[PDB]
Amino acid sequence: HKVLLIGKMYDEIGEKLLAEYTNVEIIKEPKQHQIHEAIQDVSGVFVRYPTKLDAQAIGLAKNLKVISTSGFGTDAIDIAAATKRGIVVVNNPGLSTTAVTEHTLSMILALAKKLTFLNQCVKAGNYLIRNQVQPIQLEGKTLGIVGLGAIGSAVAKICSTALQMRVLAYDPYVPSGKADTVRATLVQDLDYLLTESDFVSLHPELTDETCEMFDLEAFKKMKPSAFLINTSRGKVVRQPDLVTAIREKLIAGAAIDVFEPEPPAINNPLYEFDNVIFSPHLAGVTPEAGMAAALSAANQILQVLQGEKPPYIINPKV
């Protein structure tokens, strides 16, 4: 059996696991022709997010039996083309809770302390900015969490207890006792969260219900002094609404790690604003998180080649 890695894994341990049982070829940032030639006789494919696996490549891969993404997202793979050939598409979700939690805290604190802005002011000799702008004390402020899942709960717990924040959570699919557990208050009215919050951090699953759930109307209800943090999925925010909200001062700032579409263009209208900070979809990509996802991707590839059913099938009908 031969296996093709389109893009490197997040940690070489998954590659050595694969090399012990299959013939592996790795290609980095490939052109389409490289993909076409290397995929023809291969049994398994790994795809480093967010590069795309199209129907032409899938059709050219005569022996292909398993496709594994690098993380949770499967929007870059032509899943329909893979199910038509009966090819298993496999996921690697939920291995980066701690990484994203830490990343969310870093971005909440960064906005609160105005870190990126005050850094340039000092590097530009404007230390006298001490007399103009002031950092925000997180203690006693209200954090609003959209989505009280694995990451939302962990962020909720740290902010209420260690950082002494009041935390509200909006999540229609969770009991109020789950908020109590992490010292938060569940709220059924998103409006109450939006009007109450000094910081809003998005952690919901991307559904039809949450797609673009943060639009202009939401940004109007938010405090003008409040900040948005999005480490969930890019589609949760209606991007031009955020541009307008930032421009017209409907909110005070933003920190985002997830874009729509991905990769974002080099002329994205949000890059202009100084009160909007960015990270290139790395909240879940620490060495520890990458090692878990790499081992998970290798394992699910091997199990399919050995006929054992893997845990994270995206198209269980095949």
Ligand X SMILES: NC(=O)c1ccc[n+]([C@@H]2O[C@H](COP(=O)([O-])OP(=O)(O)OC[C@H]3O[C@@H](n4cnc5c(N)ncnc54)[C@H](O)[C@@H]3O)[C@@H](O)[C@H]2O)c1
Ligand Y SMILES: NC(=O)c1ccc[n+]([C@@H]2O[C@H](COP(=O)([O-])OP(=O)(O)OC[C@H]3O[C@@H](n4cnc5c(N)ncnc54)[C@H](OP(=O)(O)O)[C@@H]3O)[C@@H](O)[C@H]2O)c1
285 binds ligand Y (CB under 6 A): no
Residue 256 β-bridge partners: 230, 278
Is the CB of 51 or the CB of 210 nearer to ligand X? 210
CA-nearest of 121, 91, 107, 97 to 230 is: 107
162 binds a copy of itself (CB under 8 A): yes
Is the CB of 82 or the CB of 285 nearer to a copy of itself? 285
Quick one: which of 40, 97, 275, 279 contacts ligand Y (CB under 6 A)?
275
Q: Is 183 a catalytic residue?
A: no
Torsion of CA 146, 148, 154, 157, to 10 degrees: 90
The active-site residue, picked from 238, 262, 288, 308, is: 262
115 binds a copy of itself (CB under 8 A): yes
Q: How far is the CB of 204 from ligand X (least distance, A)?
A: 4
The active-site residue, picked from 29, 233, 238, 288, is: 233
CA-nearest of 143, 136, 236 to 184 is: 143
Quick one: which of 117, 192, 278, 312 contacts ligand Y (CB under 6 A)?
117
What is the distance between the alpha carbons of residues 56 and 224, in angstroms, rounded to a whole number?
48
Q: Is 130 a catalytic residue?
A: no
Q: How far is the CB of 131 from ligand X (least distance, A)?
A: 15
The active-site residue, picked from 103, 166, 238, 281, is: 281
What is the distance between the alpha carbons of residues 6 and 53, in angstroms, rounded to a whole number?
9
What is the distance between the alpha carbons of residues 7 and 231, in angstroms, rounded to a whole number?
23
Residue 66 β-bridge partners: 44, 88
Which of the residues are catalytic?
233, 262, 281
